[PDB]
Structure 1
Amino acid sequence: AVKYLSQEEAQAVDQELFNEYQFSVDQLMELAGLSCATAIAKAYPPTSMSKSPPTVLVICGPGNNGGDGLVCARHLKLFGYQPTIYYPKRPNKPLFTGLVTQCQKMDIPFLGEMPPEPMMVDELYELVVDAIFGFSFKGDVREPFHSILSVLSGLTVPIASIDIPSGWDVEKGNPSGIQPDLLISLTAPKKSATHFTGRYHYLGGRFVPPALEKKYQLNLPSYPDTECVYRLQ
């Protein structure tokens, strides 16, 4: 029975990965990101899609979720998707700088603004990746995010959330939030992930050292062969 994490649990575990075990943020983000694009490509394969190539909106927030998001975009390009990225609040740090520019020399479009009504989103993108807020977030959804979140939960087309449905109280979830169709739990799943309603819940981040796994008695599922994602249930 794979454990779902308290907010403090996760941040400590995260803590070790950078502290004791010395994974750089570069490293794990790439894999977080790779896991994401993997999950998505599996969930919703291009063959099974309605356009060639299949369009996806990646909506990246200001912290790390954004990061994973950007990686994910780029791998999904590689995987055959035609992503567009909207990245409103960008911190001025080489990491995020780097990932942006990577995406840019992938001929990945960035949008300067969110289209205002969900119907136009639905019309321009087959899948929306929610890269806004992750575990460590603690309410106070400032603009423009409230406004995007607002649009998002109006969509017909499905949303893929990275780690957390943005704006779900990380433990509470949110009865009235956005209800994404795929939730890629990274590292371990989060208490909120029990409120998850949709059709795909992959786990990702094949990097937990078994010592860490036995520490925070995670009972991780065995990933198959060489995969970096596992479907749940």
Structure 2
Amino acid sequence: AVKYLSQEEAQAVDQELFNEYQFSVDQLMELAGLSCATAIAKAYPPTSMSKSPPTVLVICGPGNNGGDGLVCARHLKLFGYQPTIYYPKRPNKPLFTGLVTQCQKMDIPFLGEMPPEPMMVDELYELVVDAIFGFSFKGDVREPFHSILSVLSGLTVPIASIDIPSGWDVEKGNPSGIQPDLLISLTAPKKSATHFTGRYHYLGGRFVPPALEKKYQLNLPSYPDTECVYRLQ
């Protein structure tokens, strides 16, 4: 079976990829976001949905996980979804300012505020993508993320979480946290993923060098043909 990483292991793998393998953040953020959009189109293919094109709200956090969300949105649009983004805390770095411009010019709207009620989210968006916090989370959910998670936990439409469900302890999960319907584990699952009880758990980030996988015994499954996601079951 695939390995489920401790937060320490995940941090080491991430730092190896950027330092020893000298991947750039742009590159792996592009592949991660693409895997997300791909996992989502396979779990919730546009023809299975009742709006045409189907609607999706992507909520982006203040760091890299939110970055992945921005990329996911752009790919989702190319895949025939109609995404909307909420991105309340944006770093002023070229990486993030670039991604914003790209999405803007793809006519993906950035909401001024979060719809305050779960019912209103449900009415407007057929799916919600949680791109708030990822494997590095140790918080301390500060505003506005506490208030956002509290809306999310009342939703009826499915949530897709990027890497980790935001607000979960990365290893121990969170019995009173959000309960997503899809979890896209990037590179390999974290220990919290044993607490997942949604329908769809995909592995994404098809970029792990074999030597890295072997050194960490990830026991990653074989991705089919040229697919960048694998459905774990």
With structure 2 as the length reference, what TM-score do the two structures score? 0.99
Distance 1:209 1:27 in 2: 14
Deviation at 1:89, TM superposition (A): 0.3
1:152-185 CA-to-partner distances (Å, cap 9, x unmatched) read 0100000000001000011110011000000000
Q: Distance in 1 between matches of 2:138 and 2:218?
A: 24
Alignment partner of 2:212: what SS? helix
- Alpha-carbon distance, 1:228 to partner: 0.1
Structure 2 counterpart SS, 1:137: coil
What per-residue deviation string (whole Å, max 9, x for no partner) do you get for residues 187-207 of structure 1? Answer: 110000100000000000000
Residue deviations 1:27-50, cap 9 Å, x none?
000000000000000000010001
Q: Counterpart of 2:200 in 1: which secondary structure?
A: coil
SS at match of 1:201: strand
Residue 139 of structure 1 and its aligned partner are, at CA, apart by 1.6
Structure 1 unaligned blocks of 5 or more: none
Q: CA deviation at 1:61?
A: 0.5
**Cα distance, 1:218 vs structure 2:** 0.4
Query: SS state of the match for residue 183, structure 2?
Result: strand
SS in 1 for 2:47: coil
Stretches of 4+ aligned residues off by more than 2 angstroms: none
Q: Displacement, 1:84?
A: 0.2
Query: Partners in 2 of 1:116 and 1:22 — Cα distance?
Result: 42
List per-residue Cα deviations over 1:33-82 (Å, max 9, x = no partner). Answer: 00000000000001000100100000000000000000000000000000
CA distance, structure 1, for counterparts of residue 180 and residue 104 of structure 2 = 27
Distance, in Å, in 1 between the alignment partners of 2:142 and 2:29 is: 25
**Identity percentage of aligned residues:** 100
How many residue pairs align between the two structures?
233
Runs (5+) with no aligned partner, structure 2: none
Q: What SS class does the counterpart of residue 197 from structure 1 fall into?
A: coil
Report the Cα distance in structure 1 between the residues aligned to 2:53 and 2:18, rounded to whole angstroms.
38
Give the drift of 1:144.
0.6
In the alignment, the residues of structure 2 paired with residue 143 and residue 22 of structure 1 have an alpha-carbon distance, to the nearest angstrom, of 34
Give distance in 2, aligned partners of 1:170 and 1:21.
Answer: 25
How far the C-alpha of 1:140 sits from its partner, in A, is 0.7
For the residues of structure 1 that align with 2:143 and 2:25, how far apart are their CA atoms? 27
The secondary structure found in structure 1 opposite 2:76 is helix
Alignment partner, residue 128 of structure 2: 128
- Distance in 1, matches of 2:18 and 2:151, equals 36
Return the offset for 1:137: 1.0
- What is the distance in 1 between the residues matched to 2:100 and 2:151? 24
| Mapped partners of 1:226, 1:116: distance in 2 | 41
Instruction: Determine the C-alpha separation between the residues in 1 that align with 2:183 and 2:162.
Output: 6
SS across alignment from 1:90:
coil
**CA RMSD, Structure 1 to Structure 2 (Å):** 0.4
Q: TM-score, normalised by structure 1?
A: 0.99
- Tell me the equivalent position of 2:116: 116
SS of 1:177 mapped into structure 2: coil
CA distance in 1, matches of 2:139, 2:62: 14
Q: Deviations over 1:81-133 (max 9, x none)?
A: 00000000000000000001100000000001001110000000000000000
SS in 2 for 1:142: coil
